[PDB]
Assembly symmetry: D2
Homo-oligomer: 290 residues x 4
């Protein structure tokens, strides 16, 4: 990892770094915000500032949410580090959408391990986020915990990637906490999902929450927090939370996935930054900061 730029924000700082990925086969960009607890003064306690991984949506770069979500404030408030990875491989030699669409090429890896040859050469985004990046970061810094108690969250496609990595690593407690903002909950029946599935994979069960959640035994009081505005333009056609609610009905996860609607809200970061506080509090209590 090499430091590309560091910005002082709130009590700590935002660091934008790059590294050659071995799963992406390309140079990848990642931003991380280190709280004021880092740079503190005590700590014989040791390496244990929790970490929240935030996956972004279609089109995004790590900078979008770094700049418009305002997680820094909450990171300083409860005591956690927050990582913003990119949305896909990116590059001149990277495959891209054959029609120039923004819902599928670079900037839209849908956090999957692509098997189709045009893409398989770089689109191993599931590995990158749940395996490589965590180890790559721990090896660059280690005061921080990027592998034990970490929480995962996201926005839209990024929200989908959150609920997905959480449910696939539940039996091993991979992520201690999971929340999402305007998540694509059932990609086998939504336009962008079916598209990415067809493009990156053949012809799906694995990778689709509404199907993966019926083969998973619930434990204790673990819940999934979801917020989604009713004035969101993509609600009706792309994000159909109600579906993940009927896939949870009469299942052990029943009543363990709350989908707070909330009136007048967008799909924009005016919507995300608004509920970030509540999500920061939700994750803090699951990471052990409150």
């Amino acid at each position: 990892m090499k430091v590309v730029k560091e910005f002082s924000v709130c009590g700590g700082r935002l660091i934008k770094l790059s590294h050659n990925s071995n799963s992406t086969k390309t140079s990848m960009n990642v931003n991380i915000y280190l709280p004021k607890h880092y740079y503190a003064q005590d700590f014989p306690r040791n390496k244990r500032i929790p970490t929240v991984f935030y996956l972004s949506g279609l089109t995004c770069t790590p900078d979008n949410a770094s700049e418009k979500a305002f997680w820094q404030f909450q990171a300083d408030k409860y005591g956690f580090a927050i990582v913003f990875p990119d949305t896909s491989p990116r590059g001149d030699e990277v495959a891209n959408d054959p029609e120039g669409s923004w819902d599928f090429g670079q900037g839209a890896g849908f956090y999957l391990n692509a098997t189709q040859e045009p893409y398989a050469q770089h689109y191993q985004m599931y590995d990158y986020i749940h395996k490589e990046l965590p180890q790559t970061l721990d090896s660059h810094f280690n005061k921080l915990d990027f592998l034990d108690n970490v929480a995962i969250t996201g926005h839209s496609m990024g929200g989908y990637g959150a609920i997905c990595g959480y449910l696939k690593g539940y039996s091993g407690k991979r992520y201690k906490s999971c929340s999402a903002f305007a998540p694509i909950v059932n990609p086998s029946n939504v336009p962008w999902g079916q598209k990415a599935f067809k493009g990156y994979l053949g012809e799906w069960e694995a990778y689709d929450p509404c199907l993966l959640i019926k083969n998973i035994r619930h434990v204790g009081d673990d819940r999934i927090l979801i917020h989604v505005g009713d004035s969101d333009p993509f609600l009706e056609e792309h994000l159909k939370p109600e579906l993940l609610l009927e896939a949870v009905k009469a299942t052990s996860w029943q009543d363990y996935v709350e989908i707070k609607k909330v009136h007048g809200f967008d799909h924009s970061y005016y919507f995300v930054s608004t509920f970030v506080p509540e999500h920061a509090e939700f994750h803090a209590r699951n990471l052990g900061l409150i």
Copy 2:
């Protein structure tokens, strides 16, 4: 005034508006956040809901600070509305820099009233901010107060245009409070101001805080709050706050103009957003909200 878009944010709302400026002759875009206090239940003497005017710097649109400085949270915390105006005339039929610089022209009005024929045609940003815009808003919303007790704040070019329109209308108490983030405190002696002063104006006395303060009568406990980071790339050559600290030395205004350098911060909105809470509190106190 017209409504382009209405987004719900925090407890209140953000409103995208366009209107036809007689001061610019051209159409103009403005953004405004109405607090959670508006939309509530009652409140009597409430008409005194102050309003903060935030001016932006070079190249900016009303959207930048609207999305990157999270004022809305502060707005709800103290109960004030905030307006984000544009930075220049803007349009196809409007003049622009002859060398295509982002320094001068559209997005670079420098909050002056243009005299030079080419620019004079539409560049009446001073009269636009301090005259037409306030009154146009009060006629569209009137409850809200864009005319009596209001504060003015800004970033860089806006920071200059903040300290300037405050000092000018000081005798008449046009603005109750005034702060700025990394402002251009003495345009004369600095390239950006020097260009805007030669291009929009001829050949300067007015429109220059370091000149205008030696002759203005300071009142009571009034002061100007300023923040600028010492890692600001433009500090040393485009915005030297220290020139105010000297121009204020030996004046009725000395000691009532404070500049806080703060180690490690940028000229970016990562810096602006870090000190928006302090500034918001500064205006809260002076606007009688607290």
Copy 3:
């Protein structure tokens, strides 16, 4: 019709125009080259000057071909005016591809009269090129013949457009001659064609050269000239010219449709500009200029 800009080229003029289209309900842009013969001096028979309509491909604007095809020179050499219309309706008011593809939507009308309700409102491009623009030009300029004996050509989407209009208006002698550069001939059974069809029309027999030509009685020694580089990146997937050939077999059109292979050529305008002189003479003979 309004004059936007004029550039003297060769011995004549390139005139960039705009006009409010009734088939489009939007202001449309069109370029036209008036040859040395216009401006010349005498000869009573004025209307004589024929016209060539050059239809552009996906993504193009009238400026592309005007700048890189070098038609002006051939225009002056033979005495014809050449018209370059736009490729589709334009504006925010005008609908666009839902995924951002250059593939369909704006810059991609496919010279069709749409029926599917979202685009049907502006995308009446078939009528715009064959019905409205001609009359529009004739009314602005009249010396120049835009309706009687005229030729039509195109590149890729524009070659398809050229051949389709020539065939549909053939029994009525709508066009005296026709040719294409790397055209799409079988819109059905081809990705860009199929997508335009599904998107603009329902479910396409009409509008398809390979299905129409089977029901059009051939006359005299009329012929369609077609060039295409064997190194065209789209040849095998998007533009299978052999199909037109295979269609024409067992049809009275047999032997009257020649596709010249031409080794090493691209799909770019380096290819087009090379075979423009041969196409310009083809048209000259059929329009009676030589």
Copy 4:
């Protein structure tokens, strides 16, 4: 040197090359057109296919002139190869205009050897075009002559380079012929030129044709051909050709600089392309091709 793209144009081929320059310490892009005369037969003499170097103007890339001047047709007609170098260093580790203007830095090297430190590291464009590029080209291909029997020409900032380099290498017969399309002939006394000099050089003398020509003994029939439409928007303030005529009076060069005004022509490539056939004839003659 390596090949990027390679397509067929007319009877020859255009070739886009890249190579690691030592004058620029950067990778530079270069386009070249090999006439049908290359790719033919034996020829004992052969090594006589001359070359013409076309320097471009402000903001240009080798692709502008390659796509809009049509030189390829002339090259095949007379039998010469033509090279289109780039206009500046190009790159993020390469300095640019501090105010983001388009008339200085990157796209605006002015074919000078920069001495001022920021730019001096990559702006050695004079040496690049007159010494590095030809030797590198000669080395990559060797039938072709890029060092001896060569002609130089240009457009605007390019015309100036063409004219300046021609005079400076006159004592050594550096170039056999020289012409220009709307050149800036007196860089001092003209805006873009003064900015170019002040930024790249200190204090100019040794790079101004109007000053250079007064100290070179004219030989034989040598002349300089220039074309510049009377409708060129920059004619009166940037390119004042009349000035080179005055510097030529009472000089041995008088009568050998012919400026053909040309009525109604723009500064655009519709202007350039129109008179390219005439300029090719001139150079061809001077290169012993006819």
